[PDB]
Amino acid sequence: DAEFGHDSGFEVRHQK
Amino acid sequence: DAEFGHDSGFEVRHQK
Ligand SMILES: [Zn+2]
Structure with a gap:
């Protein structure tokens, strides 16, 4: 996992 | 996933 x-x-x- | x-x-x- 990483998309959190x-x-x-x-x-x-990273934009979020 | 994106951890790969x-x-x-x-x-x-990104370094990996
Ligand atoms: Zn990333």
């Missing part, structure tokens, strides 16, 4: 904080994060950092 | 590539991403971007 993970949207994406690859160059753009 | 998620280590973080909040300030540093």
Whole structure:
């Protein structure tokens, strides 16, 4: 699991 | 899941 904080994060950092 | 590539991403971007 991770999506409770993970949207994406690859160059753009986490947006939520 | 996203943990297979998620280590973080909040300030540093994704490292895994
Ligand atoms: Zn992430």
